[PDB]
Scaffold this active site. Structure first.
Site, PDB file in Angstrom:
ATOM      1  N   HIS A 193       0.801  -1.218   0.000  1.00  0.00           N
ATOM      2  CA  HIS A 193       0.000   0.000   0.000  1.00  0.00           C
ATOM      3  C   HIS A 193       0.852   1.295   0.000  1.00  0.00           C
ATOM      4  O   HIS A 193       0.284   2.381   0.042  1.00  0.00           O
ATOM      5  CB  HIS A 193      -1.044   0.010   1.114  1.00  0.00           C
ATOM      6  CG  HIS A 193      -0.484   0.169   2.490  1.00  0.00           C
ATOM      7  ND1 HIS A 193      -0.496  -0.879   3.391  1.00  0.00           N
ATOM      8  CD2 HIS A 193      -0.018   1.274   3.114  1.00  0.00           C
ATOM      9  CE1 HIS A 193       0.019  -0.396   4.512  1.00  0.00           C
ATOM     10  NE2 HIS A 193       0.334   0.887   4.390  1.00  0.00           N
ATOM     11  N   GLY A 210       2.276   6.009   9.604  1.00  0.00           N
ATOM     12  CA  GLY A 210       3.699   6.093   9.287  1.00  0.00           C
ATOM     13  C   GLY A 210       4.506   4.914   9.818  1.00  0.00           C
ATOM     14  O   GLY A 210       5.662   4.707   9.414  1.00  0.00           O
ATOM     15  N   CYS A 231       3.745   1.741   9.294  1.00  0.00           N
ATOM     16  CA  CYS A 231       3.660   0.581   8.416  1.00  0.00           C
ATOM     17  C   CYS A 231       5.036   0.192   7.884  1.00  0.00           C
ATOM     18  O   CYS A 231       5.894   1.057   7.669  1.00  0.00           O
ATOM     19  CB  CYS A 231       2.651   0.800   7.297  1.00  0.00           C
ATOM     20  SG  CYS A 231       0.997   1.249   7.887  1.00  0.00           S
TER      21      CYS A 231
END
Ligand SMILES: O=C1[C@H](c2cccc(Cl)c2)CCCN1c1cncc2ccccc12
Ligand SMILES: O=C1[C@H](c2cccc(Cl)c2)CCCN1c1cncc2ccccc12
EC number: 3.4.19.12
Lengths: 304, 304
Positions: A41, A143, A145
């Site tokens: 993503h 942030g 991830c």
């Protein structure tokens, strides 16, 4: 003496954290050898998170659209590919700090350390467990991830989790390092059911053994039980059913303390039926399930 | 979302851990620049721990009696000296992995991360607090002495604790990096009184603010209190007296949530007077005091 929710030392993992940016999205990446692994993503803006077609979105991206920064230096991206829900960015330089490593898909109830990261920089390390419902009760902000979960066996780092998502419930979902989600979760911004979160019975028993070892013994009683009788109680309290495999793994702690596993089960049964009555065990007022039997032996023996 | 007992990443500290052996005793040392810091009881056998004369014992020791190993390589000891309860072993090589560092004597109620070590090798990292009675509720086995406590501000490591002792009560005592014990403890194997361990009120309030931020709000009530009225209750429950300095430090969390510090004090007062009634806050069934107001803002904002 003393029993703490202890994490593995994070040095080996810190040397692998990089920042990955694609368009306007920035998250963390894991640089092992000449590959950078990150959540797929990263190619998504907030808008296409509602219903993304990752394969169609990735078509619009070339190697130069993936900016990978390690500290203050830029890495040259010479390849990109999607493996399930992760992107593998091939770079022209092997990470000189790559430790000995493995990728492992952990079982529900197993524990691991998380090195939370923002912009490729580590902020903190904590220990947690893969819940039976395949979520993790983490501490992650936007942030984070690409932050990873791991275990260390002497000098080998077994990477087991990559952070991807926070559910509306406040719990976290993510993948193994091959990009497969733990549980039923999809990398879509949609309402997703986590499932009933049961207590990890074998871990609670291991923690009770750790309490006896560290001196807290008030909860030990004059009773015993059977696996079937205990499980009738464990069902009533949404505890995982205890099997002979669990009993076998509790063997070393049972031998260390001289308390038979079924006798410890009877102590647990009474704690479930009567509560703590305002008392604590290892500084906790609830039954702790995020220590495996292996974690208890390791912490109580000081394995480095 | 999510709130975890988070430790600082330990990489910077791992690169400083060495093994120090003197005679038959082995413990950990901290190698910063060309100096190795370790507990002075490394010159002691179990026998002289009963009543040691450190200055007389040290007279029988020369530079070559202190074996310092960093990983698999031996460090050459070119100097030795005793500063309060620590030894400073001057070696001929500066640690190439020395981070930017400071030595700080922390205040009771302040938190820090501990990198537990055995034989100069790190085993785990956990977060803890300096109790008001100057003990730490650690997780330390024999051989863990010389393990250090620290905080990190961006790239600077502030060393604040060196592990030395376990009290008969199972709690831990140690020194700052100048060798001064926190509290009244002496490095003698004798019965030592820890003192009454009170709860760190400002930290519990900070943790209540973290719970509101992370969604747990059941405990918020329709009441307010004054500092003096709250302190009458805090006295009754062996909680630290709350001052205007504590209120000022809770300012940012009070602004973030819109809940006045005295209104949060009233919520705390009711929780103390009525208990949790079987409910939890941030996965805990007791009031947590090992998060400072700074820790809550940092974890809730993701400072790296
Ligand atoms: O959950 C998400 C988003 C997301 C949505 C749907 C599917 C997937 Cl794979 C990811 C993308 C942005 C970052 N993110 C977050 C991840 N962890 C903690 C977060 C805390 C607060 C806010 C967002 C967080
Ligand atoms: O407490 C001591 C001893 C000691 C005695 C008196 C004064 C001083 Cl400064 C130190 C020396 C040996 C190691 N040690 C330990 C330190 N931490 C955790 C321990 C867990 C179990 C057993 C011993 C532990």
């Amino acid at each position: 003496s003393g029993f703490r929710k202890m994490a593995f030392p994070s040095g080996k993992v810190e040397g692998c954290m990089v920042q990955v940016t694609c368009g306007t999205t920035t998250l963390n990446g894991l640089w092992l050898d000449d590959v950078v692994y990150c959540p797929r993503h990263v190619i998504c803006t907030s808008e296409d998170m509602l219903n993304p077609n990752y394969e169609d979105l990735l078509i619009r991206k070339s190697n130069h659209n993936f900016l990978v920064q390690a500290g203050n230096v830029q890495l040259r991206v010479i390849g990109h590919s999607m493996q399930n829900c992760v992107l593998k960015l091939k770079v022209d330089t092997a990470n000189p700090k790559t430790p000995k490593y493995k990728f492992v898909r952990i079982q529900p109830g197993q524990t691991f350390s998380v090195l939370a990261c923002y912009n490729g920089s580590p902020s903190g390390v904590y220990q947690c467990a893969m819940r039976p419902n395949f979520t993790i009760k983490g501490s992650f902000l936007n942030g984070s991830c690409g932050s990873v979960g791991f275990n260390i066996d002497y000098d080998c780092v077994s990477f087991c989790y990559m952070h991807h998502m926070e559910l509306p419930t406040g719990v976290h979902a993510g993948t193994d390092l091959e990009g497969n989600f733990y549980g039923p979760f999809v990398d879509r911004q949609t309402a997703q059911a986590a499932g009933t979160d049961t207590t990890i019975t074998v871990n609670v028993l291991a923690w009770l053994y750790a309490a006896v070892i560290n001196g807290d013994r008030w909860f030990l009683n004059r009773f015993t039980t059977t696996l079937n009788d205990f499980n009738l109680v464990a069902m009533k309290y949404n505890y995982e059913p205890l099997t002979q495999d669990h009993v076998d793994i509790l063997g070393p702690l049972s031998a260390q303390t001289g308390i038979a596993v079924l006798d410890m089960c009877a102590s647990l049964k009474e704690l479930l039926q009567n509560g703590m009555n305002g008392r604590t065990i290892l500084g906790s007022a609830l039954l702790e399930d995020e220590f495996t039997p292996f974690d208890v032996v390791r912490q109580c023996s000081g394995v480095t």
